[model samples]
Target: AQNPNCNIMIFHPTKEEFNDFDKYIAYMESQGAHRAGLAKIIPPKEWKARETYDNISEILIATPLQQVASGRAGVFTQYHKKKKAMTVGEYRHLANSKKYQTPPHQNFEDLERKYWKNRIYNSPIYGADISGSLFDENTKQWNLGHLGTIQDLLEKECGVVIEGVNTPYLYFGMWKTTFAWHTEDMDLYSINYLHLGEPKTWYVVPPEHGQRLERLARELFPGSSRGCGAFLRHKVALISPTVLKENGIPFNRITQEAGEFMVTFPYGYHAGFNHGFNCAEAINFATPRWIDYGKMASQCSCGEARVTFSMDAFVRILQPERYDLWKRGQD
Candidate 1:
């Protein structure tokens, strides 16, 4: 009666080992039926293109429906009413307008820094935008029933992760200039493909470089607790793979096509910015772990609303080590 069953796993292999067909079956036999329930993330590079959006508008409409809907079909009527009125650029200007706040700067960075710190926490503000779109002009409002259909399409097309925000709420309009600096969700692994428009400026610093910034920020801030203290000093490598090979850091090896690079943040790092272009990108955002929800709540000041779901708890159970990785600046 004193025994609680224990599982043991052991494997021995040299640096170079290849198994023939029978050897493969042998390995499977050993792993037989013991599904640890440890979910593995499939990189986008390894996936086939599933669903693709022709334009940003469709992506914008469907996102809100997917977020809070208990039944995607039933939400179409309500979603259409909301998606019709959205004016991405205008909504951004109004939300962060100087008249509503203390001396506002004309630049997006100045406004975003102020707005992010002060965005309305968990009432219906952010959720409403997610569930429904916001348009600038009252006269422009119309139903976009296509909303639910789009979400269904995305799910069928993209298997693992599907993430979309009500872009208007974030105040990132169709024009690329508004997106500033580096920001990424801590717990999501995604591939943001450029589906349309001319290439805007993109900067990719190797993981080594990213790690280097983490170290430098520690030194520059002199006892700063902000996870990513100052992302400004991070240099953009121009030579690409040439320097990466020489430095012994893995280069842009993820994608064979030039601009399509893979960003896999083992832990999160502040990436780059996108300047103006009308684009459609398919992103795969993994379901947030409970801790990720908590962080989103903390970062956005959503409070106890974060606990409404088991996202953080699931994350704690699934990726326990990640649960300990302190957010860069917050640590």
Candidate 2:
């Protein structure tokens, strides 16, 4: 049978329906949006896109196909192989070519490098804790620094602190740039807003298919993930949604445009590519539900050692609640 409305969970909420951040998420979750592991939200017409990136910097860009062609699929290796630093203007200049042109650099090793193929234009500067990067009051609601103070649960509830991983990471993209399939750090939630620019095509796997996604990842590239189990953390390995569906994994596809939010849920797997030019911001978040997943989820050695938020502190906030529930599961 042909897929009927593969974009089933995408929602459009009016300002009234979009109450507080987490509450809207809960409302959608109650509506069974959670089952899909990813939800697309179109804000009411009145809400304009907020953040800006007038100030650009030395962006570390990646060449994905280059890495894959070399038989390596890990994120760091992709960047490490071609992790060159060029100012936003330089990237823009190179990307602006009707045909993408390579810069006249001393180290022109590969002819394809000159072609600028399979690159993800990662600027990550808008809400990246830099000067003049602050959001004004008018922009606060949608601005990531001020966003999801409730639903994300990390900073609001857990005082979760981490840059790039926790705070807003802005990106600039052009045709064919790709983010390989992966979950948010620590199995937390993430909301990505495309401020403006071209549409992005996304592929998602519901939470139920999470394990199958990982099994596929292991089969594709075993070394990418350590025994620590944070293989997805590598953000390496690219698998087409078509390949996933061919293997019996449920795949959800949607085209996210400017002024849209792509909210990825706990343990949900997602990946996508840009249609053309775009600007977007993304960050990780947590809620009480994340705690349930946290207790059950496993991680890599680096993930194990790193603590972005304190679970102990989370428990300390409430004294009597645990005592009431712990005894039942214990005995």
For all predicted structures, in order, the TM-scores are 0.33, 0.70
Which ten contiguous residues of candidate 2 have the minimum total lDDT? 123-132
Question: What ranges in model 1 sit over 4 Å off?
Answer: 1-85, 88-188, 221-270, 285-311, 319-331
Clashing pairs in 2: 152-286
Report the number of the highest-TM-score candidate: 2
lDDT of 2 by residue, 71-162 (tens): 42222223223444555566566555765433344432232232234343432111121222224457534566665433345455455542
Model 1 lDDT tens row, 1-331: 1111211122232212222322422352245311111111122232222233232343332221111111112110011112334443433343344432233356545533433333222111111223322222321111121112222323454343334321212212222122211223333333343333333233233322445434543443333324223333222101222323455432221111222323233123332223223332322233212234323321211121122122343334434454544222223
Candidate 2: list runs displaced more than 4 Å. Answer: 1-8, 51-84, 99-136, 148-165, 223-228, 302-331
At residue 16, give the lDDT of candidate 2. Answer: 78
